[model samples]
Target: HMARNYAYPHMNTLKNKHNIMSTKKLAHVCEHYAKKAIINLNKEPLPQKFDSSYLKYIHQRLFESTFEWAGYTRDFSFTFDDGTVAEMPMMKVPNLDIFYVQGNDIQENLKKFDQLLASKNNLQGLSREEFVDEAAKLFVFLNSIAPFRAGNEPTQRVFFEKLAEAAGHQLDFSVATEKRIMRACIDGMTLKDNMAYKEMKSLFEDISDPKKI
Candidate 1:
């Protein structure tokens, strides 16, 4: 299907879209996936390791939930060096990054997270509100990173599970739910258009009222 479009030699697929509607469509698509990712994570099990296969399971669940919720399907395959593609299977994380970054920066970020882990109180001892507050922040951070190229949906789910394990509760996400995920979708947009962060914060507040969930 895509072959008829940029599957050819087109330099930019965005040009093919009418007034760049395709670009907007793509954004909504991802937002839908992000919502599904959260819902799926609400249902996933805690993992012992953060690796590729486990990441893929979250991806698959998010994909399934996205389709169910939004009725839209976009390319979810991760590309590889040999010019072949790999479908994200249940595994650790596949090296799927749309943008490149300095390895030093990533190392620094990991070190910071390690420090956070060391300074944090034992999650098991916290009240439900306290735990959910912390978990929601972590979810927002992972969602902000947008780290995966293809398996973003699944990767997000796993992130949520890790949070749940920390809090010692497996949230039942199967209950039908709808949480606003995007307040804005624009390029060079205002700081508030950063819906991934703002939305996650909203989730933290909303969880306070279980009826809202």
Candidate 2:
């Protein structure tokens, strides 16, 4: 169905001659393919602490959801009762300490997301995989969430460094250093908005499958 909808009109396929059922089935096919990719990558046994597939799917969903939220409007901001500036297109500041109670922890947010992905349920005591997976998910989620009003891209990239440190991996992205894409995504003009959501749709399409990475 994907090949059909996407083929010619998107991509051509044999036996897909105008079949809506084929299109519906294509989604499952793509998901299954994504799982297959994970299986190929999972040469070693899964870490005893958690399910890799579970973590993978959660990251996939949350990343996409956050992206959707980003596209909700050309602009988004929150106001506090204390008469303080929270977020705006040109500037932003987040209270790290208050995150313990009000804002969600970069650590806890991803950990909870991992648990939810696994077992199709939520619990505590994340395994090694769960923890690592959550950190990876946070890298993408923070980018989408744009926690601050401005400089979210650089901050998100910095968060990725922290995530790598937490997960014991080397992670970096030059875009953050160059164009500061995160900041563009947050405070700057969005090509997605200018293009009538075509850009945003394309962005989500690339990340829809969890197993791709």
Candidate 3:
């Protein structure tokens, strides 16, 4: 079965350099390249400063091989080859009615999210449990933002990987399976007393190991 288009404004399978139109196939291709890229990305040192630009750079590095607009955020303005400008487009969850932050407010929300994280010192210097609790909230909020049109999860995982590294911990994300991730996000996104946040904390707790002194 083909994936019903989840993009806002009903654009088809994102005009890709691969010229591939099948969403499922593109998913496979993007994952293949993104995983390889993540390995290379892990070898690099994180910048002393972390912000919205840093997050955008993470997306670019993660999906540049798969998407020409890899670094472009959900609200990034795009100009078509035919001189048409694509404004804000809302992202939809395929097969579900869930929608993320609106295009109109995405940039502001991202700025706010960044500011909030910065005010917390970019989630640095925390015990394992505190890290888990905070990281789960961070993950849930970012999921609600859904920063990029595609590859939001991996990008966030890497962002967290770096954040955890700075906090003197290593995050083993292989423990997190895709269904569990989506389920946690769905529950967390619901805002029904933050069950998903707890689930996210469980997931994060399961994956984290403190760095040995």
Candidate 4:
């Protein structure tokens, strides 16, 4: 049976030819194709750095035939709220203008990040802590931008995974619990300080090969 924990509000009007209305079923199908895409991606040589196009490519590869809006930067706005009825308060994403602005900012950040990775042979020399810090930065930025309408986290995680591999490092998410990850992500996005980085850094472990590093 499919898990309901990951269920999100589905767009009834937007669906594939299969007309799969159930979020769980569609998610399952997407997961299957995503695995296939990951295999294909792993077979290709890694890039020195990543950009917006790479992100779109990964999203399209993962959910193109499945989601009609796949690979497209979200034009409209969306708010993601997390908290229980008894919780102190809820959290929300920014407005449409803020969202778009952050999206563009993230694109620029990626370009700069890529450049930094290659300049002065940086990637090879990066330590585990440094790698996690870099990943946290990217992750937090993406979370703020909320680029695509769906599949943002999965796509980002995969893209980051490729980046880690290219940098001679690896990320192990097995240590990160779903609750902690979500809490950290929410805290990172909503907090006023740099606490987000700290919260996110706890979610992944750097396991790069010594020979390559």
Candidate 5:
């Protein structure tokens, strides 16, 4: 699948040159393998805490051949300019050290969320709604963290997709158009409340396997 169209700074040029076609092609290739890795990992237990390290692995596996800093947390900060059609907010990222520390803390909360589900024997007996709630929370949490320099959405979705598979459910975001997903994420992040979980859970519900229900 094509990644969401966004402006890549000249400094972020790829090995294939900085043209839009080449960049999109490269993104397609990288995303392909990223999804493949997620699918393969689906056969195994996903990390209990989908932490920053695991996030790096996803990015690295996808772009390692094309990028030198694959599998590493970004050292620089960035912001989203509002010139795009999405009308994304002008948001500034935290300092690198602060970002990393916050990432670690957020990841610990993800682990605890998983632990809570496991303690309920969710691994053996799970409810679709409850699973959506948990997955949505984790997804939104990771989105808020946005630890990577790029490819955050695709990487996070692949991670959550694998988690859904491991939980005996299929996540099909195909029903929720990319625009809708992006908007929901932006709104969720901005609100910083139940709105995030609520919005994501709605999206998840739209695409969750009804057979499992």
Candidate 6:
């Protein structure tokens, strides 16, 4: 969800720090920085807790140099830990007919997600396969959360990548392609039955393995 100022053209696309309105260029630049940031985060003191705020922090860090509204899923008067001011406001995902969790609905949906995760004890005791199954469901639900206007996929993927280690697994996107993940997410986010989850579970299986003992 984004306000109008982030978009350009006679249509819709996000503006970047370079003031570039070209969508591909914006993606290229953002992906480059996001890749570096996720790698660097792997070496930092990560949060022991996984929740909405942690996801926001990851979103902010990933796009800090690229978007003025990086970490905000909704409008806020608060500043981030990095001292940047938050100004992003909530809205429907622009230029799409698809239904993501609505702007006002996000906070409560995320709370349900958090409470579900808590019930599963952060998925700690599952078999590796079962972990993949659980993680896939979580990923789909969070993907549907669709917090930021863009970059929600990368943010959640990297968040889960970091979280996997706690459950004795590792995610290696080297085995997966962007299209594969995108297709799986589409199915997972749209389907009505177990097949939705089946798609993501298969994708997660392709991209993950048990950590070395």
The lDDT for every candidate, in the order shown, is 0.42, 0.34, 0.75, 0.61, 0.58, 0.76
- The digit string of per-residue lDDT tens for model 6 on 1-213 reads 225545653546665676767787888888888878878787886566778888888999899889777887754443444454443444443454577777667788889988877788777777889889899999989988787867787788778887787767787655788888878878886678878988888888878854422
Query: Residue-wise lDDT of candidate 5 within 66-117, one digit each (tens)?
Result: 5444554433222223332211122234332222225335445546555654
Misplaced by over 4 Å in model 1 are 1-45, 48-111, 114-122, 170-179, 184-199, 207-213
lDDT (10s digit) by residue, model 3, range 1-213:
112223323556765667677788988888888888878887888877667788889999878876666787757676544444554467786667888888778888888888878888877888888888988898888888887877788888888888888877778677668898788888787757747688888878878854321
Candidate 3 wrong stretches, greater than 4 Å: 1-11, 82-84, 194-196, 209-213
Q: Could you tally the backbone clashes for each prediction?
A: 12, 8, 0, 0, 0, 0
Per-residue lDDT of candidate 4, residues 180-207 (tens digit): 7777777776677767677777665422
Q: Please estimate how well model 1 matches the true structure, expressed as its whole-model Cα lDDT.
A: 0.42
- lDDT score at residue 159, model 2, on the 0-100 scale: 36
Highest TM-score among the candidates is held by which one?
Answer: 3
By TM-score, rank the candidates, best first. Answer: 3, 6, 4, 5, 1, 2
Give the Å shift of residue 11 in candidate 2. 49
What range of 10 consecutive residues in model 6 has the weakest lDDT sum? 78-87
lDDT of 4: 0.61
**Pairs with steric clashes in candidate 4:** none
What's model 6's TM-score? 0.83
**How does candidate 5 score on lDDT?**
0.58
Q: Count backbone clashes in candidate 3.
A: 0
Clashes (candidate 4): 0
Error of 2 at 177 (Å): 8.1
The alpha-carbon deviation from the true structure for residue 151 of candidate 6, after best TM-score superposition, in angstroms, is 0.7
lDDT score for residue 165 of model 1: 60
Kindly list the per-residue Cα lDDT of model 1 for residues 1-213, writing each as its tens digit: 322232213343222112334555755665676676666466755554443344445555555433221211122343323344333122222243322222224334434443444456424567666766565555544433343333444455545546556556544333324334323111112244344345454454454445645
